[PDB]
Structure 1
Amino acid sequence: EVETFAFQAEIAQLMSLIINTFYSNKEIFLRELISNSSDALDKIRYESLTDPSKLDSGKELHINLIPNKQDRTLTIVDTGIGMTKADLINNLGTIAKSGTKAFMEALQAGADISMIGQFGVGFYSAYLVAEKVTVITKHNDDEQYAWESSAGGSFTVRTDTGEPMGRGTKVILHLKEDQTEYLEERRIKEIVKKHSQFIGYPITLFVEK
């Protein structure tokens, strides 16, 4: 049972700008996704301060980076608050309509694409490097769902049949054929050290083979 949705016109416009604009500094996608994961981990931490049972779905608060050269995927996993089905459909918990508006007024006033995260739509920087993005998520108040989009104006949502997650979000980047440098251990390490060195949660870079 797969539901197919149209992006709001402004989000489709943001996504086409990210895909079609010539912009070499693509590596900031990882900073933006790690920052999103950190924000989601902050939220479940804050909720657990007054209700410890919110961590019954998992006490550990962390971020994992999993490259897979055979599948040509880079997966960013966190054990944050996760997203309900409603949040997934509503632009993955973002204020994407007003954020895109603010972002594009900034771009014509001297900003560049690397500043996307200041406008709440940093998730969509995934399409700097990915031809398709899958988002698997589990929130304490909902079931496990899979969101997917290859851009082109539509996304799908289905109940996830895969591995149970407990709580949190998994962003699977199906990389473009010429963006496989982001599967290389030394390149990911360099980017994490450059842009994410002060994130307040353990970031574990998995190795392969």
Structure 2
Amino acid sequence: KSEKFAFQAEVNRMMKLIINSLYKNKEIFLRELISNASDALDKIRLISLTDENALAGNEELTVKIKCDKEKNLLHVTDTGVGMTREELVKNLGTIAKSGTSEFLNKMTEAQEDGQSTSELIGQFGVGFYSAFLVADKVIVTSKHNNDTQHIWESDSNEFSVIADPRGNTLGRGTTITLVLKEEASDYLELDTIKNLVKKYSQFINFPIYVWSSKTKTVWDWELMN
């Protein structure tokens, strides 16, 4: 069932521009993933204004982050609109929106003339690729109301998508799972993550939680705002 895809040339070029723009500020990948989560939540929220049963799959509007130090994984899960199988392929593997092309041109000129680029990344919502600054593999699990749950996975050299054999476990939404590089093990530390989530979530309009422990050890979702 697993279908293999090559990234579109432009996406390969875009990944490299992003990586180089944020190379000395890797922590920004988290800000971009939170921003993506927020936007996805805003979208399902707007859809609920016109579709009564829009939230049926998962009545919560949240962003939940968990570290799995013992598995070397960082998970960022939102209960936003999600993506159908076709949207996974299109959004992650091609220059989907008319605007991505715009970002690509603007990014190239800005990078050429020394103008700041981190803002452009956030403006066009193409920050996902910055996850490759800290991860050897990025996995995206998503569930949209119009489709079944699928998994997209990539080490940046190609990507594949398969129907999730685990069924509908998200309800609705998306999980970004990062298999962290050795040099990035710091992001597996709850304290580093909380501090970062807190620094990048005060502006978000949705509640953001991190699976944290107290220690007898108490494990639960801690609100960062």
* TM-score (structure 2 length as normaliser): 0.85
Distance (Å, rounded) in 1 between the aligned partners of 2:153 and 2:20: 20
| 1:5-154 correspondence runs (5 A) | 5-19=5-19, 23-92=23-92, 94-95=96-97, 96-112=100-116, 114-115=118-119, 116-152=121-157, 154=158
Q: In the alignment, which residue of structure 1 is the partner of 2:220?
A: none
Aligned-pair identity in percent equals 50
**Superimposed CA distance per residue, residues 42-96 of structure 1 (whole angstroms, 9 cap, x where no aligned partner):** 0111111122201111110000011001111100000000001111111239534
Relative to structure 1, the CA distance from residue 31 to residue 159 in structure 2 (aligned partners, 3 Å threshold; closer, same or farther) is same
- Bigger mean CA offset, 102-111 vs 117-126: 102-111
* 1:11–1:100 CA contact under 8 A, matched in 2: no
Q: Which runs of 5+ in 1 are unaligned?
A: none
Relative to structure 1, the CA distance from residue 113 to residue 60 in structure 2 (aligned partners, 3 Å threshold; closer, same or farther) is same
Give 1:186's aligned amino acid: D
Give 1:118's aligned amino acid: Q
* 2:63–2:77 CA contact under 8 A, matched in 1: yes
Give 2:140's aligned amino acid: V
Q: In the alignment, which residue of structure 1 is the partner of 2:222?
A: none
Q: Which runs of 5+ in 2 are unaligned?
A: 218-225
The structure 1 segments of at least 4 consecutive aligned residues displaced by more than 6 Å after TM superposition are: none
Relative to structure 1, the CA distance from residue 20 to residue 136 in structure 2 (aligned partners, 3 Å threshold; closer, same or farther) is same
* 2:138–2:154 CA contact under 8 A, matched in 1: yes
RCO higher in structure (CA 8 A, sep ≥6): 1
Distance (Å, rounded) in 1 between the aligned partners of 2:58 and 2:50: 16
Give 1:91's aligned amino acid: N
* 1:99–1:120 CA contact under 8 A, matched in 2: no
Q: Determine whether 1:206 maps to 2:217.
A: no
Give 2:159's aligned amino acid: F
* TM-score (structure 1 length as normaliser): 0.91
Number of residue equivalences: 208
Which of 175, 191, 194 is the matching residue for 1:189? 194
Distance (Å, rounded) in 2 between the aligned partners of 1:58 and 1:110: 44
Relative to structure 1, the CA distance from residue 111 to residue 149 in structure 2 (aligned partners, 3 Å threshold; closer, same or farther) is farther
Q: In the alignment, which residue of structure 1 is the partner of 2:221?
A: none
Give 1:165's aligned amino acid: L
Which of 161, 166, 169 is the matching residue for 2:174? 169
